[PDB]
């Protein structure tokens, strides 16, 4: 029964919850087990980066996150084409590729290809037969500089352009920010109905004289 002031509470405990309760007593053991698997995987791919393939620079979708950049699934086929990497060779040298991603703008395309070209420069390639190096790399640097990279390969990094303090022009001071937003909302709201009324007036003008 209700008793004095309080919050009307609606607990969801009418459905025999006690038979489906997930305890977390294996959480410390689970963290240990994944960490052993991470260490075992890193040893298995001895010189290859532990985190895995290089991932592309990706802008987050919605209007909440579209100022923020993250890592994506894989580089686009267009990104690989202008970077000069075959889409079937890239996965063999640690480049993740997403066949189903398109590049709607050039800036995103152009930013990711510099990521690929720069990664290609940083890449040390071991010959398939160590005795006979065809086109892998010079043995001088592949011997000593070969080290398993820890963490994500070239971590995706949100960069902010620093704006230099400047003198405010009179044109900037005369701009009406609030009025522009209010007028822009009205223009977008009445665009369709204004065209219809203009069209209906056009039909009146083609037959004004009769």
């Amino acid at each position: 029964a209700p008793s004095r002031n309080g919050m009307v509470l609606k607990p969801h405990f009418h459905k025999d919850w006690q038979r489906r309760v997930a305890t977390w007593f294996n959480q410390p053991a689970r963290k240990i087990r994944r960490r052993k698997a991470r260490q075992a995987k890193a040893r298995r791919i001895a010189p290859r980066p532990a985190s895995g393939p290089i991932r592309p620079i990706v802008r987050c979708p919605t209007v909440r996150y579209h100022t923020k950049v993250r890592a994506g699934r894989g580089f686009s086929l267009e990104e690989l084409r202008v970077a000069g990497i075959h889409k079937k060779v890239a996965r063999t040298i640690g480049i993740s590729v997403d066949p189903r991603r398109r590049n709607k703008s050039t800036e995103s395309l152009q930013a990711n290809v510099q990521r690929l070209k720069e990664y290609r420069s940083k890449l040390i390639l071991f010959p398939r037969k160590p005795s006979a190096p065809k086109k892998g790399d010079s043995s001088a640097e592949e011997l000593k500089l070969a080290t398993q990279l820890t963490g994500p390969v070239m971590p995706v990094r949100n960069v902010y352009k620093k704006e230099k303090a400047r003198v405010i022009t009179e044109e900037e001071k005369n701009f009406k920010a609030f009025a522009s937003l209010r007028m822009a909302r009205a223009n977008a709201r009445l665009f369709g109905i204004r065209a219809k009324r203009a069209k209906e007036a056009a039909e009146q003008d083609v037959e004004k004289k009769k």
Binding site: R166, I168, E172, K173, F175, K176, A177, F178, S180, L181
Partner: peptide, 27 residues
């Protein structure tokens, strides 16, 4: 003191106060 404020939206009074101190609002 003047300042240039960059925002997606401005309220009417926020714009007025920024211009009162000699600043500007840019969208």
């Amino acid at each position: 003191q003047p300042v240039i404020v960059k925002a997606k939206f401005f309220s009417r009074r926020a714009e007025e106060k920024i211009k009162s101190v000699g600043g500007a609002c840019v969208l």
